[PDB]
Structures are given as structure tokens and as C-alpha cells.
Design an enzyme around this catalytic site. Structure first.
Site, PDB file in Angstrom:
ATOM      1  N   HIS A 182     -10.271   4.243   4.162  1.00  0.00           N
ATOM      2  CA  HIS A 182      -9.223   3.404   5.109  1.00  0.00           C
ATOM      3  C   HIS A 182      -9.852   2.058   5.070  1.00  0.00           C
ATOM      4  O   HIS A 182     -10.256   1.372   6.107  1.00  0.00           O
ATOM      5  CB  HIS A 182      -9.511   3.961   6.583  1.00  0.00           C
ATOM      6  CG  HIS A 182      -8.110   3.446   7.378  1.00  0.00           C
ATOM      7  ND1 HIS A 182      -8.149   2.630   8.334  1.00  0.00           N
ATOM      8  CD2 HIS A 182      -7.042   4.166   7.309  1.00  0.00           C
ATOM      9  CE1 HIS A 182      -7.206   2.600   8.743  1.00  0.00           C
ATOM     10  NE2 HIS A 182      -6.206   3.659   8.356  1.00  0.00           N
ATOM     11  N   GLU A 209       0.862  -1.176   0.012  1.00  0.00           N
ATOM     12  CA  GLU A 209      -0.091   0.050   0.012  1.00  0.00           C
ATOM     13  C   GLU A 209       0.861   1.449   0.200  1.00  0.00           C
ATOM     14  O   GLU A 209       2.252   1.274   0.262  1.00  0.00           O
ATOM     15  CB  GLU A 209      -0.906  -0.055   1.107  1.00  0.00           C
ATOM     16  CG  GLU A 209      -0.097  -0.312   2.573  1.00  0.00           C
ATOM     17  CD  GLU A 209      -0.850  -0.001   3.614  1.00  0.00           C
ATOM     18  OE1 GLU A 209      -1.221   0.997   4.005  1.00  0.00           O
ATOM     19  OE2 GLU A 209      -1.063  -0.921   4.749  1.00  0.00           O
TER      20      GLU A 209
END
EC number: 3.1.27.-
Length: 109
Positions: free
Chosen positions: A101, A72
């Protein structure tokens, strides 16, 4: 110099198979003095964003393949506390995005 949007990064990843030069891992960042609770990443590493760490997926929110690793990178970061934007990229280059998120992800690539 700062490629930190979903199309720019998606871009870069697909073409160079690595993150642009303004990304550093949590680790490197800590090494530079970042203290999460202080929200000071931009003071110790101006122009940098967190990115490059393994993302586990043991919850299968992302398509899995035996042997595939997910990574990520924070998106849209300038300064302050971290936001909810992330770019998810696999071993074999599938690219996803999340703006909440990791609640939900969208295929980009």
C-alpha cells in the site's frame, strides 16, 4: 476477460496505453453502489477492479518529471475489501508496483 495480475496489466498498459476492460474508477464504482465500508465492490460490479485514478506522488516515492501524471490500478482483486496491491503507471509509460500500500515500489517497466 479479467487481466488483474502485475505482468498481465503491465503488459496490457505497455501495449495498449490504457487499462483492460475490467477496471473502473472509484467514481464509476460509487455510481454502481460500492460502499467501501461494506466491502461490496464485487456485488455491485462483478468482475471489476478499481483503477484509473490519479496518484499524486507529492512525496516523491516515484520518479518525477514536470508534466508527468501518475495513475494507479488495484492488482489481484477478486472480491471483498481492497488489498495492498497496486500498479503505478505514468503518462510516459514507466510502470511500478507496490505490494504494501505504497510503502515501497519496484520498477516493472
Amino acid at each position: 476477460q479479467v487481466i488483474n495480475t502485475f505482468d498481465g496489466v503491465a503488459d496490457y498498459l505497455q501495449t495498449y496505453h490504457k487499462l483492460p476492460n475490467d477496471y473502473i474508477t472509484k467514481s464509476e464504482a460509487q455510481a454502481l453502489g460500492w460502499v467501501a465500508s461494506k466491502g461490496n465492490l464485487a456485488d455491485v460490479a462483478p468482475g471489476k477492479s478499481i483503477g484509473g485514478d490519479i496518484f499524486s506522488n507529492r512525496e516523491g516515492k516515484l520518479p518525477g518529471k514536470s508534466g508527468r501524471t501518475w495513475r494507479e490500478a488495484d492488482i489481484n482483486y477478486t472480491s471483498g475489501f481492497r488489498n495492498s496491491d497496486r500498479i503505478l503507471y505514468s503518462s510516459d509509460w514507466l510502470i511500478y508496483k507496490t505490494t504494501d500500500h505504497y510503502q515501497t515500489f519496484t520498477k516493472i517497466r
